[PDB]
Amino acid sequence: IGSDRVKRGMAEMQKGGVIMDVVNAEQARIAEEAGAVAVMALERVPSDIRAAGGVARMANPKIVEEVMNAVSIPVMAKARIGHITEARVLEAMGVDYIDESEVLTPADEEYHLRKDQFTVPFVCGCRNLGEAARRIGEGAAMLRTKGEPGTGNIVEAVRHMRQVNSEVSRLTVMNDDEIMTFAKDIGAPYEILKQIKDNGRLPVVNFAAGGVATPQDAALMMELGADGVFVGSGIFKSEDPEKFAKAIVQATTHYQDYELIGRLASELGTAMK
Amino acid sequence: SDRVKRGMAEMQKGGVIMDVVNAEQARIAEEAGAVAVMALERVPRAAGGVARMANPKIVEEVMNAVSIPVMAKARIGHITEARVLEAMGVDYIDESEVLTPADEEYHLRKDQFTVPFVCGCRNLGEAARRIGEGAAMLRTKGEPGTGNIVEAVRHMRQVNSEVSRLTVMNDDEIMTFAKDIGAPYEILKQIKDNGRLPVVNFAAGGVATPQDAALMMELGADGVFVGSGIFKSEDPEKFAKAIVQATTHYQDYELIGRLASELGTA
Amino acid sequence: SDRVKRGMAEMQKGGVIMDVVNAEQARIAEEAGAVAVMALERVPSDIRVARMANPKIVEEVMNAVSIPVMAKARIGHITEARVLEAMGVDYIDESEVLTPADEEYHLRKDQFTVPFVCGCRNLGEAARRIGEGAAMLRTKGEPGTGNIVEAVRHMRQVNSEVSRLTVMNDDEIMTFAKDIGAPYEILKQIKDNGRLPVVNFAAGGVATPQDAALMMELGADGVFVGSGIFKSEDPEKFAKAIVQATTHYQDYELIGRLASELGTAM
Amino acid sequence: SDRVKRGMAEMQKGGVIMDVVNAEQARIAEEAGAVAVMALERVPRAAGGVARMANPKIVEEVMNAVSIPVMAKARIGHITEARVLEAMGVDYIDESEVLTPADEEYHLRKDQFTVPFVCGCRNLGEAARRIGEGAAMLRTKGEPGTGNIVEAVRHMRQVNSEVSRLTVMNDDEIMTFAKDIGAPYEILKQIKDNGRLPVVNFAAGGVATPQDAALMMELGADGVFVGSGIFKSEDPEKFAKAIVQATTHYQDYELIGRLASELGTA
Amino acid sequence: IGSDRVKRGMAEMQKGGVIMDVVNAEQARIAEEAGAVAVMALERVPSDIRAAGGVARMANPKIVEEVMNAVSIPVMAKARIGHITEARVLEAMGVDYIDESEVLTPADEEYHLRKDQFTVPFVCGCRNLGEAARRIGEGAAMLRTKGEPGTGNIVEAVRHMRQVNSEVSRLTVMNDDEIMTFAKDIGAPYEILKQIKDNGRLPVVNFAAGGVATPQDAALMMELGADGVFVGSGIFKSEDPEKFAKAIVQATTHYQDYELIGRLASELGTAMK
Ligand SMILES: [Cl-]
Ligand SMILES: [Cl-]
Ligand SMILES: [Cl-]
Ligand SMILES: [Cl-]
Ligand SMILES: [Cl-]
Ligand SMILES: [Cl-]
Ligand SMILES: [Cl-]
Ligand SMILES: [Mg+2]
Ligand SMILES: [Mg+2]
Ligand SMILES: [Mg+2]
């Protein structure tokens, strides 16, 4: 169901961009006006999710369409891992992407969605080439570091991006007759690995996500080789989300303009661990 | 006589059974479209104490407020609790691990009763022993009172996987499969000749939203139990109708999406 | 070009392949009814460092018979297999019976034009060998022991997990594949094919007509035999006995008839 | 170009570098005789949270209040944080484990920068890897923010002991010394031909009293870092001058005794 | 750099050929006659060193001299690991290379020779990039797999060669700011590993050694990325050493001529474990 070309093709249009977890119209248009290339709709931002605890389910559909009605950029929404019904509901709503998101308390602790049997594209989280390849093999069209969401600490996301990238590059120059047992050893589908090698990188875009709290943070992920940046708590849990948003957008676009980043950097206190 | 008992269980297939605490709740359930109600004293309770059966005044009040079948819970292995409810004329007893067990080693001989029983399970071994004792209905154990669907998903997947694997198992391997999972070897041979369970297996344990109940039907259940999900929530009567409609129309994603418009539990 | 490699392998479905060490054993094999022969220097039994056979021994067996010839090569030994392929053998057996040359990596059999056969013991090893381009599988068994039990375990083990897979949920095959070490793509094909997309022969320990019949009863697509034939009294009758027993594995009166020789392997 | 960088580091030898939080502090430091200042947002902080680099307004304010070199900290491995400070024109960046690391496996490639770096260490292995990455300065890690000198004593003793032991090590034993301590084998051969470290190694971590700073100089340091010791204390400007004077006149025990007249930290 | 260029240059001159363990002039002539690019003087071939056991020291200098007189191809001799004066004596005899061979009883179990302070070039054993880098940093000009000498079993040489090449190739595409941690993790000199990346491969030739018993064996190591082949027990503990020799040489240089290797191989009777 669907096409890989179409799903992956669309996700690539956000390359270089910043995506913003938002909770209402106001946050949504703030996201759009500040330069976000897509929004992510949710009921409460990952910082409040770990605080509130409880069971984190998908958002009320009322919330999602109120955001879709606020913005001209693509709207993403989260669904619980394996929650077949939540994804189908979101997809019928016509969201541009669903995030099978480990930020939400799962519904299935052993099996993820068969995302190839959907038409809406899916973004899936990961921490290494084995997880990336299982999600890709399930039909994911976009990848992002799992990171450590809601902590404003970038280190975990740095670790994951570094690990996926390292394993991928190792595979791109790996002996053909060593790939099967490489795949065995990391728990990855042999043919996805064989694709990845021939493509010379991942066949989907791999964003950074979790603990981006400062412009330098975002520019750092791009320096580390991310295809783009998610950020939710870091922006709206700050003294001026409007300024923080435009700072993180410019910093991600000009991640090597070090004096623009320092200039931009003059704002105020932000999220903490 | 198992044909009678199981056959009355099947008349619930596809429906929603709701835990109810008094008569308002009882017919709020019935008005909203429930196929049955569970009479109980505290919805899943994790307050504390010892959970025994309801007072019979509470069961009787519930049977006297609706025409859809009424079930009630008894502690595991509590011979007189089950016999008392059976004399009251409930339609089903649930020998329910939601209540403090009275016997921690041996369940009731439900074949030596005339009222049909529903018992919980988590895998084919528990489902086969409860069937062998004479259960006429099965439900996942799940994780009641938590509003988290994940454990019921795990149990539905485990029961169904082992069932479906048994349906195509070599004849001469079923004995030592039965040894390995702890199951009556004849109940397993029955399950193979039937290609599914001889009883209906409902989901139960933390159904909180319309999409929850629908997910369970998508996953292969025959129906849905729901208790805390409804009344522990903002405007329950609306929650009731939505969960009933989602459980019947569980692939109508536009309908489920609309239905989802309210404010959940926790 | 995998359909053509796998299609030739099916030409032996139902037959008996025989380890022969020279022209006259190769002729005995063909006379008795072998569908193919395995050229090799020391039979699996009295093997117990083992490299490929001298090419001279191999071509002698090609020269003696008109049914296809296979020869073994050490696991992962690129130039042993390349030499064999360029001598024109019909199949190469990347065989664990020989001392492995690469303990971590097998050959990329898809990058060859001669079709390959590999051993396995479970759906995991099977899928990985198929993923590398094996065209035909055999149980690893316990070669040279005249004892069938390991081949029985391997056959039963492969067939159970295949069966489990033909009815396994779609959204579970990835976690299955991870848990058993299998290429996910191959398991989805096995499901769609309803069986393994290559033929799986029983190998290792077949010592009597009854053994060859048992393996076929158990689901195999054919039998490999080596030791139990020539390390017995009158190998020529032992061959004809086993060949007939394999094609008529449910003609039990014939097998008992046929079972009328003397001493055997181990 | 390492000669340039390290040579500007040496112009601090014998002095005191002070953590400062705004401009008053900054020139209180300079008035009292500091050789350099560390710009930071919270003096060692053990309050909590995530410690990132200072806001550039805070760094700029500090550089605009003194003429002695200004340093600032960046999280370990935070490529853009270091690049940002480098564009601001600080004199040194400290890749500082006092701040929450941004990379927990890999430190910055400091040779690919033009501003000199100071990095922490606890032994010759950490000192040799930081040097090999391009550090132009070393400081003990110690135990910052605790006012306890003991961990910096331990680290100075360990670095110096291993250095001095390396200076007289047999040529043909340095490789497997380098393996054992985790160090670049060329950096170790350099250290031997030089008879000491090629950079200056300052003490840092809980200098609270004049006798503390002097003890570090007695122990073989090239200088003293101090942050909490000064401003977290009764009348800091007096503490400042006393620690500057004790670090220069570190064997003048009558002078240190007089200087010690005030009231410490905790 | 400098006299390393010369040392390494001279070892490269045997790239593609076969070096042969010989023990007297007649064996040494067979080697040269059959096409060897070099010979290795020793007193027992690794098969007998294993069976006799005892203490295996350098060869008696007559045996070496007898061998250098008998041939015009370079002569190598073995010395115990870390035996300073065994190497110095061999150097003064004018051998062309010394093998600091772990096939001999190590005289030093903790510290190898400082090879950069000799003028004769050295070949060293290894099993992974850590050992390789440490031998290079000590001044080796040539590497070889440690294999499992005397066993006639190629599997160990295959593992060592596959590991080295895997770690090398992974290094050639490895991030600059990760080579420190990589070097630490494997026990390698950080600067040698930065070299290996720059040159895009090992800066010295790395031969296969230990267990070559048939032409197919030798050809396989060439197939695996070896720069050349050592062989000792495999020849002279076989039916016809002279025919085994030329067949090995031919098969090493034409290691993708499967028609030829097959032809060559049809003269057998070999060694085993
Ligand atoms: Cl996020
Ligand atoms: Cl009873
Ligand atoms: Cl219930
Ligand atoms: Cl066999
Ligand atoms: Cl860098
Ligand atoms: Cl400090
Ligand atoms: Cl050797
Ligand atoms: Mg900032
Ligand atoms: Mg809801
Ligand atoms: Mg004091």
Q: Which residues contact residue B4 at a Cβ distance below 8 angstroms, ignoring those fewer than 6 apart?
A: none
How far is Cα B101 from Cα E205, in angstroms, rounded to an integer? 74
Rounded Cα distance between B161 and D150, Å, is: 61
Rg, C-alpha atoms of chain C: 18
The answer to whether the CB atoms of B170 and C156 lie below 8 A apart is yes
- Using left for φ > 0, alpha for ψ between -120 and 50, and beta otherwise, residue D223 falls in left
Structure tokens, C33? 């009814």
Cβ atoms of E75 and E68 within 8 Å: the answer is yes
Residue D194: how many other CB atoms lie within 10 Å:
11
Distance B51 CA to ligand 9 centre (A): 30
* 8 Å CB contact of A110 and B157: yes
* Torsion angles phi and psi, residue A238, rounded to 5: -125, 170
Are C34 and C18 in contact by the 8 Å Cβ rule? The answer is: yes
> What are the phi and psi torsion angles at A150 (to 5°)?
80, 5
Chain E contact residues (CB < 8 Å to C): 151-155, 158-159, 162, 213-214, 216-217, 219-220, 223-224, 255-256, 258-259, 261-263, 265-266, 268, 270-273
Contacts of A85 in chain B (CB under 8 A): 211-212, 214-215, 218, 250, 253, 256
Ligand 10 centroid to Cα of residue D254, in Å, is 14
Amino acid (one-letter) located at D118:
V
For residue E144, the cross-strand partners are E125, E207
Residue E181 with chain D: CB contacts under 8 Å: 105-106
Which positions in chain C touch E154 (Cβ < 8 Å)? 77, 101
Pairing type for strands B200-202 and B224-226 reads: unpaired
CA atoms within 13 A on the CB side of B118: 29
- Report DSSP state, residue B77: T
**Which residue numbers of C have CB closer than 8 Å to A's CBs?**
76, 78, 104-108, 111, 128, 131-132, 169-172, 174-175, 177-178, 181, 183-186
Element (H, E) at A180: helix A179-186
- The span from the CA of C177 to the CA of B253, in Å, is 30
Chain A hits for E170, CB-CB cut-off 8 Å, are 169-170, 173
Are the C-beta atoms of residues C51 and E220 closer than 8 Å to each other?
Answer: no
Q: From the candidates D73, D110, D232, D238, which is the catalytic residue?
A: D73
Chain C nearest CA to E91, separation (Å): 37
For D58, name the nearest residue in chain A, comparing CA atoms only. Answer: A266
User: Per the annotation, does D19 bind a ligand?
Assistant: yes
Counting ligands in written order, the one closest to the CA of B77 is: 2
Cα–Cα distance for residue pair A112/E43, rounded to 1 Å: 65
| D145 labelled ligand-binding | yes
Q: Name beta bridge partners: D117.
A: D93
Question: If DSSP codes are grouped into helix, strand and coil, which group holds residue A85?
Answer: helix
Q: What residues have CB less than 8 Å from E185, skipping those under 6 apart?
A: none
User: CA–CA distance from B55 to each of B44, B60, B82 (Å)?
Assistant: 17, 9, 13
d(CA C104, CA D190): 41
Does C227 count as an annotated binding residue? yes
Token pair listed for B133: 């004792």
> Residue D35 in contact with residue D15, Cβ under 8 Å?
yes
Q: Could A152 and D50 be called an inter-chain contact, meaning their C-beta atoms sit closer than 8 Å?
A: yes
Instruction: Report the distance separating Cα C219 and Cα E71, nearest Å.
Output: 64
Q: Are B257 and A93 within 8 A, CB to CB?
A: yes
The owner of tokens 């005249």 is C146
Residue at token pair 């999602």 = A64
Please state, as a whole number, how many other Cβ atoms lie within 10 Å of the Cβ of residue B179: 10
Ligand 5 centroid–CA A52 distance in Å is 39
Element (H, E) at B48: none
Shortest CA distance to E79 belongs to which of E54, E52, E53, E60?
Answer: E60
Q: Quote the CA–CA distance of E75 and D253 in Å, as a whole number.
A: 70
Read out DSSP for chain E? --HHHHHHHHHHTTTTSEEEEE-SHHHHHHHHHHT-SEEEE-SS-HHHHHHH-S---PPPHHHHHHHHHH-SS-EEEEE-TT-HHHHHHHHHTT-SEEEE-TTS--S-SS----GGG-SS-EEEEESSHHHHHHHHHTT-SEEEE---TTS---HHHHHHHHHHHHHHHHHHTS-GGGHHHHHHHHT--HHHHHHHHHHTS-SSEEEB-S---SHHHHHHHHHTT-S-EEESHHHHTSS-HHHHHHHHHHHHHTTT-HHHHHHHHSS------
A92 C-alpha vs ligand 7 centroid, how far in Å? 70
Q: What is the spatial distance between Cα C36 and Cα C91, in angstroms, rounded to a whole number? A: 10
Q: Which two tokens stand for residue C148?
A: 């069938």
**What's chain A's length in residues?**
273
- Identify the nearest ligand to the CA of B142 by its number: 3
Q: What resolution in angstroms, rounded to 1 decimal? A: 2.8
d(CA E162, CA E184): 21
Alpha-carbon distance E99 to D184, whole Å? 25
SS3 B266: coil
**What residues in B contact A77, CB-CB < 8 Å?**
none
Q: What determination technique applies here?
A: X-ray
Integer-rounded Cα radius of gyration of chain E: 18
Are A145 and A265 in contact by the 8 Å Cβ rule? The answer is no
The string of DSSP letters for chain D reads: -HHHHHHHHHTTTT-EEEEESSHHHHHHHHHTT-SEEEE-SS---TT-S---PPPHHHHHHHHTT-SS-EEEEE-TT-HHHHHHHHHHT-SEEEE-TTSPPS-SS----GGG-SS-EEEEESSHHHHHHHHHTT-SEEEE---TTS---HHHHHHHHHHHHHHHHHHT--GGGHHHHHHHHT--HHHHHHHHHHTS-SSEEEB-S---SHHHHHHHHHTT-S-EEESHHHHTSSSHHHHHHHHHHHHHSTT-HHHHHHH--S----
CB distance D243 to D16 below 8 Å: yes
Question: Distance (Å, rounded) from C-alpha E69 to C-alpha E88?
Answer: 20
Question: Do D and B have ≥3 inter-chain CB pairs under 8 A?
Answer: no
The response to whether B157 counts as a known ligand-binding position is yes
Q: Which residues contact E257 (CB under 8 A, 6 or more apart)?
A: none
| DSSP assigned state of A72 | S
* The amino acid at E130: G
Query: What burial class does residue A1 get, using C-beta atoms within 10 Å of its C-beta: 0-12 exposed, 13-18 middle, 19+ buried?
Result: exposed
Does the annotation list C156 as a binding residue?
A: yes
Minimum-distance ligand to the CA of C18? Answer: 4
* Chain E residues near any Cβ of chain A (below 8 Å): 162, 165-166, 169-170, 172-175, 178
SS (H, E, C) C44-96: CHHHCCCCCCCHHHHHHHHHHCCCCEEEEEECCCHHHHHHHHHHCCCEEEEEC
- Whole-angstrom distance, CA of residue E191 vs CA of residue D133: 10
The Cα E82–Cα B182 span in angstroms is: 64
CA distance linking residue D201 with residue D126, whole number of Å: 12
E strand or H helix at A77: strand A75-79
Substitution target in C82, C174, C179 with the highest count of A β-carbons within 10 Å is: C174
Interface test with B, best of A55, A65, A78 (most B CBs within 10 A): A55
Token code pair at residue C247: 């094609």
- Estimate the crossing angle of helix A179-186 against helix A129-137, to 10 degrees: 100
Cβ-nearest to C174 among A137, A180, A190: A137
Chain E residues in contact with A162 (beta carbon < 8 A): 175, 178
Which of B86, B12, B5, B11 has its CA nearest to residue B53? B86
Q: How far away is chain C from the Cα of A133, in angstroms, using its nearest Cα?
A: 11
CB A38 within 8 A of CB A19: yes
How far, in Å, CA of C254 to CA of C263, rounded? 20
Could you say which of A78, A115, A146, A246 is catalytic? A78
Q: Which of D260, D240, D110 is nearest to D224 (CA)?
A: D240
Report chain E residues whose CB lies below 8 A from the CB of A165: 175
Burial class (CB in 10 A: 0-12, 13-18, 19+), B185: middle
Of residues E78, E115, E146, E237, which has the active-site annotation?
E78
Closest by CA position to C55, among listed C88, C27, C25: C88
Q: Look at C166 and B168 and tell me if their CB atoms are within 8 Å.
A: yes
Name the one residue in this structure whose structure tokens are 């019921």: B152
Closest CA to C202 of C263, C246, C244: C246
Task: Check if the beta carbon of residue A74 is closer than 8 Å to that of residue A81.
Answer: no
